[PDB]
């Protein structure tokens, strides 16, 4: 029903004003590279190992929002086919901060690797475009690890450790960018390993907001992704905590 | 219209499930009570001065979804007096990490200092209750300065300051907690002057995430908050930044 895909991308707008319009939302992508930079500066690495950065890049290093608001003025629910068109219309953004951190550690004994769910044969082209035109330094086809068979990275993660690096912080805006310890699971789950990882946020785990997508949206109901739109409407207003309007 | 209050209200939900069940909001401020650890440490202040942190309280310690979640379910849109109800039912939780933040700091020679946008007339009752409950350690009265006359915060930045202290950092959700200087102004002011400031963030501008509401959401329309519903649904619909569906 186009009433029902109306409904759940209205959803999203709230959210989409904030990342797209506010200040604030810059502010939080400023503290996280501020924090990401002195976490570097001080990391030391194992005798014998490169120093690596992992960063993810949709909504890490990239901004995509603009297909969010295609979502919303369209009524279009996400599809793959989609995105893969958005890709290859080389019009991402920046996230604020992202290119001079990146670029600050390649330029100081350090090396980002782009771990993303970008995918590699169909998505890579427009990806490499599009950084290079915003100023991203280290873009050479070898800094990408590109969504292959699976859309978990910790194994692509540890294809860089043997390449000879040692991973020194990570940063994403999806847990999932962390390693694959709560890939796939409800959000219960995630608030978990987020409690039994506290003290490494702003640390080694390096946050950006994304308040429109992402394993948190899976994580509101068991197969979440599989639901038909009205499902995911439900899934979405039962996860909602509601004051009684009492005293 | 009662359609026009749903459509209005609707537009909030998936930030809302970000807010209240993601793992990655918890990240988030956990990164940023983190952060902010690391600025009192290495805070020092002029000599004679004693050391203050000022913190916002709604979305920054204190979590208010619930009323969200009303808001969302009983298709309302915000009005001061249900929100009045709201601190008078005692039912305000703590954002993760804030009270641990707020009790060190509280016992490593500092002194945090609530500047918050609750009514200090009607609201203080609930708010020192909420606080107690939660786990704040000093939350007398005088560590307050809730709103009276006005809803800029810097006159009671400068109230702390002519009692001795010296403001070593401050916590907030809204750049209106950090001064004056884009208070009431649209959201093109608001990011101009996070790009002013882009080095102060993560280390003496400490932020939280909130995709719900705040100056940001004024910030998307001139008289904004002045607008009926209708008008507030446009103004948010017309802020989106949308990809035209071309190559
Ligand atoms: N709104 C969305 N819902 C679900 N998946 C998405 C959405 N937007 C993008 N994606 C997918 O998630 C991937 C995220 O990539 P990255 O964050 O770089 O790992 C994208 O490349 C898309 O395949
Ligand atoms: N959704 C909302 N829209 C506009 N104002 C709000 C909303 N929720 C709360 N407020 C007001 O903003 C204040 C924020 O307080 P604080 O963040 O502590 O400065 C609250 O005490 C309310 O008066
Ligand atoms: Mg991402
Ligand atoms: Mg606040």
């Given at each position: 029903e186009?009433?029902?895909?109306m409904?759940?991308?209205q959803?999203?707008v709230?959210?989409?004003?904030?990342?797209?319009?506010?200040?604030?939302?810059?502010?939080?992508?400023?503290?996280?590279?501020?924090?990401?930079?002195?976490?570097?500066?001080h990391?030391?690495?194992?005798k014998?190992?490169?120093?690596?950065?992992?960063?993810?890049?949709?909504?890490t290093?990239?901004?995509?929002s603009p297909?969010?608001?295609?979502?919303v003025?369209?009524?279009?629910p996400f599809?793959?086919?989609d995105?893969?068109?958005?890709?290859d219309?080389?019009?991402?953004?920046?996230?604020?901060?992202?290119?001079?951190?990146?670029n600050?550690?390649?330029?100081?004994?350090?090396?980002?690797?782009?771990?993303?769910?970008?995918?590699?044969?169909?998505?890579?082209?427009?990806?490499i475009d599009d950084m290079?035109?915003?100023?991203?330094?280290?873009?050479?086809?070898?800094?990408?690890?590109?969504?292959?068979?699976?859309?978990?990275?910790?194994?692509?993660?540890a294809?860089?450790?043997?390449?000879?690096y040692?991973?020194?912080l990570?940063?994403?805006?999806?847990?999932?960018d962390?390693?694959?310890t709560?890939?796939?699971?409800?959000?219960?789950?995630?608030r978990?390993?987020?409690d039994?990882?506290?003290?490494?946020?702003?640390?080694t785990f390096?946050?950006?907001?994304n308040?429109?997508?992402?394993?948190?949206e899976?994580?509101?109901?068991?197969?979440?992704?599989?639901?038909?739109?009205?499902?995911?409407?439900?899934?979405r207003?039962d996860?909602?905590?509601?004051?009684?309007?009492?005293?």
């Amino acid at each position: 029903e186009e009433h029902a895909n109306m409904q759940l991308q209205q959803q999203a707008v709230l959210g989409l004003n904030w990342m797209q319009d506010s200040g604030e939302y810059k502010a939080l992508a400023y503290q996280a590279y501020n924090a990401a930079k002195v976490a570097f500066d001080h990391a030391k690495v194992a005798k014998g190992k490169k120093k690596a950065v992992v960063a993810d890049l949709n909504e890490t290093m990239l901004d995509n929002s603009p297909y969010a608001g295609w979502q919303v003025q369209n009524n279009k629910p996400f599809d793959g086919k989609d995105w893969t068109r958005w890709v290859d219309a080389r019009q991402s953004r920046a996230v604020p901060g992202a290119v001079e951190f990146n670029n600050y550690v390649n330029s100081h004994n350090g090396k980002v690797f782009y771990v993303t769910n970008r995918k590699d044969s169909t998505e890579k082209s427009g990806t490499i475009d599009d950084m290079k035109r915003l100023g991203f330094n280290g873009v050479e086809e070898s800094a990408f690890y590109l969504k292959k068979d699976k859309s978990a990275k910790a194994a692509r993660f540890a294809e860089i450790e043997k390449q000879g690096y040692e991973i020194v912080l990570y940063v994403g805006d999806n847990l999932d960018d962390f390693g694959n310890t709560v890939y796939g699971k409800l959000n219960a789950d995630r608030r978990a390993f987020v409690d039994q990882n506290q003290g490494k946020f702003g640390k080694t785990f390096i946050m950006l907001p994304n308040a429109n997508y992402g394993g948190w949206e899976g994580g509101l109901a068991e197969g979440y992704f599989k639901k038909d739109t009205q499902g995911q409407i439900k899934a979405r207003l039962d996860a909602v905590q509601a004051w009684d309007g009492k005293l």
